[PDB]
Design an enzyme around this catalytic site. Sequence first.
Site, PDB file in Angstrom:
ATOM      1  N   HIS A  40       0.905  -1.128  -0.076  1.00  0.00           N
ATOM      2  CA  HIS A  40       0.082   0.162  -0.004  1.00  0.00           C
ATOM      3  C   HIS A  40       0.890   1.150  -0.011  1.00  0.00           C
ATOM      4  O   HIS A  40       0.569   2.280   0.075  1.00  0.00           O
ATOM      5  CB  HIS A  40      -0.994  -0.114   1.303  1.00  0.00           C
ATOM      6  N   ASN A  54      18.385  11.940  10.730  1.00  0.00           N
ATOM      7  CA  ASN A  54      17.690  13.097  10.587  1.00  0.00           C
ATOM      8  C   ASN A  54      17.302  13.201   9.022  1.00  0.00           C
ATOM      9  O   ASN A  54      17.977  13.275   8.230  1.00  0.00           O
ATOM     10  CB  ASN A  54      18.493  14.379  10.871  1.00  0.00           C
ATOM     11  N   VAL A  57      17.932  16.570   7.121  1.00  0.00           N
ATOM     12  CA  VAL A  57      19.222  17.301   7.063  1.00  0.00           C
ATOM     13  C   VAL A  57      20.326  16.297   6.250  1.00  0.00           C
ATOM     14  O   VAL A  57      20.277  15.394   6.903  1.00  0.00           O
ATOM     15  CB  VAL A  57      19.766  17.598   8.519  1.00  0.00           C
ATOM     16  N   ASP A  84       0.225  -7.562   1.912  1.00  0.00           N
ATOM     17  CA  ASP A  84       0.578  -6.162   1.952  1.00  0.00           C
ATOM     18  C   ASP A  84       2.253  -6.161   1.973  1.00  0.00           C
ATOM     19  O   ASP A  84       2.752  -5.926   3.138  1.00  0.00           O
ATOM     20  CB  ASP A  84       0.074  -5.381   3.233  1.00  0.00           C
ATOM     21  N   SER A 172       3.010   1.842  16.264  1.00  0.00           N
ATOM     22  CA  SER A 172       3.812   2.204  14.930  1.00  0.00           C
ATOM     23  C   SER A 172       2.256   3.071  14.540  1.00  0.00           C
ATOM     24  O   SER A 172       1.242   3.068  15.110  1.00  0.00           O
ATOM     25  CB  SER A 172       4.008   1.090  13.996  1.00  0.00           C
ATOM     26  N   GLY A 175       3.202   6.384   8.398  1.00  0.00           N
ATOM     27  CA  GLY A 175       4.387   7.211   7.956  1.00  0.00           C
ATOM     28  C   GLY A 175       5.357   6.053   8.483  1.00  0.00           C
ATOM     29  O   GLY A 175       6.504   6.059   7.910  1.00  0.00           O
ATOM     30  N   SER A 177       4.436   2.601   7.982  1.00  0.00           N
ATOM     31  CA  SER A 177       4.224   1.707   7.033  1.00  0.00           C
ATOM     32  C   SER A 177       5.260   1.209   5.990  1.00  0.00           C
ATOM     33  O   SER A 177       6.146   2.095   5.709  1.00  0.00           O
ATOM     34  CB  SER A 177       3.116   2.022   6.024  1.00  0.00           C
ATOM     35  N   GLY A 178       5.319   0.005   5.867  1.00  0.00           N
ATOM     36  CA  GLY A 178       6.436  -0.509   5.031  1.00  0.00           C
ATOM     37  C   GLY A 178       7.751  -0.751   5.941  1.00  0.00           C
ATOM     38  O   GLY A 178       8.730  -1.493   5.232  1.00  0.00           O
TER      39      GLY A 178
HETATM   40  N1  LIG Z   1      -1.771   1.478  14.329  1.00  0.00           N
HETATM   41  C1  LIG Z   1      -0.699   0.883  13.666  1.00  0.00           C
HETATM   42  N2  LIG Z   1       0.073   0.149  14.175  1.00  0.00           N
HETATM   43  C2  LIG Z   1      -0.586   1.269  12.290  1.00  0.00           C
HETATM   44  C3  LIG Z   1       0.288   0.973  11.406  1.00  0.00           C
HETATM   45  C4  LIG Z   1       0.584   1.618  10.270  1.00  0.00           C
HETATM   46  C5  LIG Z   1      -0.543   2.413   9.574  1.00  0.00           C
HETATM   47  N3  LIG Z   1      -0.517   3.147   8.542  1.00  0.00           N
HETATM   48  C6  LIG Z   1      -1.617   3.836   8.340  1.00  0.00           C
HETATM   49  C7  LIG Z   1      -1.857   4.780   7.350  1.00  0.00           C
HETATM   50  C8  LIG Z   1      -2.764   5.508   7.470  1.00  0.00           C
HETATM   51  C9  LIG Z   1      -3.025   6.501   6.554  1.00  0.00           C
HETATM   52  C10 LIG Z   1      -4.196   7.723   6.537  1.00  0.00           C
HETATM   53  C11 LIG Z   1      -4.316   8.623   5.327  1.00  0.00           C
HETATM   54  O1  LIG Z   1      -4.964   8.202   4.529  1.00  0.00           O
HETATM   55  O2  LIG Z   1      -3.967   9.966   5.591  1.00  0.00           O
HETATM   56  C12 LIG Z   1      -2.423   6.376   5.374  1.00  0.00           C
HETATM   57  C13 LIG Z   1      -1.529   5.422   5.124  1.00  0.00           C
HETATM   58 BR1  LIG Z   1      -0.398   5.329   3.626  1.00  0.00          BR
HETATM   59  C14 LIG Z   1      -1.244   4.594   6.175  1.00  0.00           C
HETATM   60  O3  LIG Z   1      -0.312   3.705   6.028  1.00  0.00           O
HETATM   61  C15 LIG Z   1      -2.149   3.747   9.663  1.00  0.00           C
HETATM   62  C16 LIG Z   1      -1.400   3.062  10.541  1.00  0.00           C
HETATM   63  C17 LIG Z   1      -1.770   2.485  12.045  1.00  0.00           C
HETATM   64 CA   LIG Z   2      19.688  13.176   6.857  1.00  0.00          CA
END
Ligand SMILES: NC(=[NH2+])c1ccc2[nH]c(-c3cc(CC(=O)[O-])cc(Br)c3[O-])cc2c1
Ligand SMILES: [Ca+2]
Length: 223
Positions: A40, A54, A57, A84, A172, A175, A177-178
Amino acid sequence: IVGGYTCGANTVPYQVSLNSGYHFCGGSLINSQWVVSAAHCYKSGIQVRLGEDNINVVEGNEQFISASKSIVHPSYNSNTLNNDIMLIKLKSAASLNSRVASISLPTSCASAGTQCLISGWGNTKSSGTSYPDVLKCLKAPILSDSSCKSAYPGQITSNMFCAGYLEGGKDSCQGDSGGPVVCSGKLQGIVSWGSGCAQKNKPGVYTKVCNYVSWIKQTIASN
Ligand SMILES: NC(=[NH2+])c1ccc2[nH]c(-c3cc(CC(=O)[O-])cc(Br)c3[O-])cc2c1
Ligand SMILES: [Ca+2]
Ligand SMILES: [Cl-]
């Protein structure tokens, strides 16, 4: 990462940042030319950033390499997030050293209670958005399948597992994700989804990497 700590520069040498003019997902380096991330997180125009701490930077140790191709698992379902996982091939190989290194794929799946390290530059707030400049770390255990199914009835497949704290506060988030879930030095999971972030009784759900080792090896071998 919500309720985590600052990892410390380059202490997680296999962590990568997927960048499209901003950081949008994490990934793990598994060899000098391939990265594993979540399906995703797929988009075109990805630049993989290795050796980062960072992300705003240039501090030294960074290697920015364009992805040559992204391979989303053929059975990925964007509605259930089953399968996924995605492999990204780098345009050139990365120079591995102590600051940039690959992580090993597992030979067996991990058991409930195994403690793992989850890292990323994802949101640090459960109630709002706050994105960090440096890499955050969280130590979390894998939960039993019964607790996981109890938390997400009907949404957990055999290719997913839950890790975290039912009390909420540590998890987590978007942001992250992956990115990697490493347990005893092997990549056991990929940050995939969850209900909100760090909510009570809503632990994170991760892609179960041990179910994909043969697919990963065969795909890399043929590309
Ligand atoms: N509770 C967790 N452990 C968890 C882990 C990965 C996640 N990824 C996301 C996720 C949410 C959005 C929301 C949006 O459409 O702005 C987008 C992405 Br791409 C995400 O991977 C939620 C999320 C929650
Ligand atoms: Ca950097
Ligand atoms: Cl169920």
